[PDB]
Amino acid sequence: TDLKASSLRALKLMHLATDTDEKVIALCHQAKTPVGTTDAIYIYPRFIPIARKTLKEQGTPEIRIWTSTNFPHGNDDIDIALAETRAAIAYGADGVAVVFPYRALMAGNEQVGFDLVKACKEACAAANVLLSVIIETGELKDEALIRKASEISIKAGADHIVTSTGKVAVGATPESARIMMEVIRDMGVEKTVGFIPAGGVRTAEDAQKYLAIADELFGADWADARHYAFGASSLLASLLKALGHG
16 A cells, blocks of 8 residues: 555654663664664663664664754753753764754744754764754744744754654644745755654554655655654554554
């Protein structure tokens, strides 16, 4: 089916998320699936060194390790976000998702959002570490605030843009996803900027819906390079079930 094909694609692009050392170890094992390797795991900074060991010893050092900083609050203190990103880096992260200061933007502060992302991009770039920016669409709400946060994050050097922390009641929607990818399209940056719909993606069918918008806007070669699934091990179990496993 279409649902089988898209569940396999989603799984290969998946950032598997989840709290203890043993829970993270079990995450790593899940990430090595019967149909292949998820793209990444997503975990709190302190768990990075044990996750690295585990992925290497199960024979999958190609699985990437993502984490977040300025998280989930998106405060506007650049000193703190920056120290936190340096820490994540020293722990061994392959990518750092920073939370955009979306509240400062909603209050009228566009400069702070630029300067924060740009400071965290510098640190990351200096260590060959990818930077995502979580804008928190559930909280911004307005189409024009979503465009604006997306656009500021791109100009400041975001490698990917991400809907949601998953720590507010509202995560990704199809319209949210649509808006942020249109920013990527309109600015001309699809070759260097990808996209993650995050928060409340539960089922194989939810994941197919997001994939379809990416295929629609940029085509299936873009989406296989740069459109990441995001969810917990319930989302993964469901993609596996769609493929006839478990």
